[PDB]
Homo-oligomer: A and B are copies of this chain.
């Protein structure tokens, strides 16, 4: 089978009270356990996603101009005028121009002259934000395998109890572990794609915008050139200007209002006072083949997918970091407890390597993998 049991160290049983157990369910891993003559337990992180996010600031990449009107005056005729100077639907430019007999204007000199046009945006991109009323983890408690119940847990209401047969009441109690600062990050949506970019950056892009109907610095796209006895220019469709600008950007698969994420959660189960069964896996001695190259993740860590070539399943996977210097730093491992359930199922490791030149080591003895990695750290 498929799921990983709990070690000896991560649950307590009080003479009285109950059995409190720690758990870090991760994106793509299930955790397991049982007591005597009680059926097995399976705890799995169904998925993490955010739905229905606020609209933070709508931006016009590409707009058209309508109903264009001027009024100019001769000299000694004062400033040209137009009611439209009040409506924030028109950009309008007031310049001064030259009138001669060259335009029905008796005298020489320079004549006031203003000119407007309706500004109408046609392609808008959206910057959105995520609060607690948008996050939800879906979480499986399943009791060979069978029926399973689905707890759904949130930032606002992270306590679920659950009535498991053979085991009785069980409260879950969860909190995200390894992720994103939606306090710094906006979700960006241009037509069919969603990127994910640092707020400040987002808020600083040269364009007409609107508080998530009335545009702002419309002029950024619509301009006026040399007036004659005026004409208004404009830059094109922005799709392209951007795509080149969103270049470094974490990309995301989204659908409508839902958006899915690779979630780490971290819970503690509280259930009636029970002697569970710990397991403490034997440390591995086969060697590890790299399956597929070391990728960055979008919750900030670095995934590496190994493949175990020995007769050990199951076992703890010996792993190790050094920095440029060469120093073992004893940490930097997201995937707290990375164990070979069964060969043939390559195994993931999520680690947060240090800045600069990092040396990851997987495996015991010779034939251990030694990856270089590189890190460098801006917006």
Contact = CB atoms under 8 A, between A and B. Distances in A.
Contact of A10 (B150, B157, B270): B270
Contacts of A154: 331-332, 352
Contacts of A329: 150, 152
A352 B76 contact: no
B133 A300 contact: yes
A45 to B, nearest CB: 14
A132 to B, nearest CB: 7
A78 B113 CA distance: 14
Contact of A301 (B98, B151, B157): B157
A17 B6 CA distance: 10
Nearest to A6: B17
B204 A151 contact: no
A88 to B, nearest CB: 10
A131 B8 CA distance: 34
Interface stretch (A64-72, A236-244, A271-279, A286-294): A271-279
A26 to B, nearest CB: 12
Contacts of A56: 200, 379
A99 B56 CA distance: 50
B12 A20 contact: yes
Interface in A63-111: 75-76, 78-79, 96, 98, 100, 107-110
A355 B272 CA distance: 34
A218 B253 CA distance: 39
Indicate the member of A51, A131, A181, A204 with the most B CB atoms within 10 Å. A131
B156 A330 contact: no
A211 interface: yes
A305 interface: no
A22 interface: yes
A360 interface: no
B24 A17 contact: no
A9 B169 contact: yes
Contacts of A275: 15-16
A157 B333 contact: yes
Interface string A12-44: 111111111110100000000000000000000
Nearest to A132: B300
Contacts of A15: 13-15, 275
Contacts of A149: 330
B76 A108 contact: yes
28 contacts: A8-B272, A9-B18, A9-B171, A11-B17, A13-B14, A15-B15, A17-B278, A24-B159, A51-B355, A52-B355, A52-B376, A52-B377, A54-B379, A55-B378, A56-B379, A76-B100, A96-B110, A108-B109, A149-B330, A152-B332, A154-B352, A156-B300, A156-B334, A157-B352, A159-B333, A160-B330, A160-B333, A161-B336
Which 3 A-B residue pairings sit nearest by Cβ, starting from the closest? A12-B14, A159-B336, A52-B377
Interface of A: 8-22, 24, 51-57, 75-76, 78-79, 96, 98, 100, 107-110, 129, 131-134, 149-154, 156-157, 159-162, 169, 171, 178, 181, 183-184, 198, 200-201, 204, 211-212, 226, 270-273, 275-276, 278, 280, 300-301, 329-334, 336, 351-352, 355, 376-379
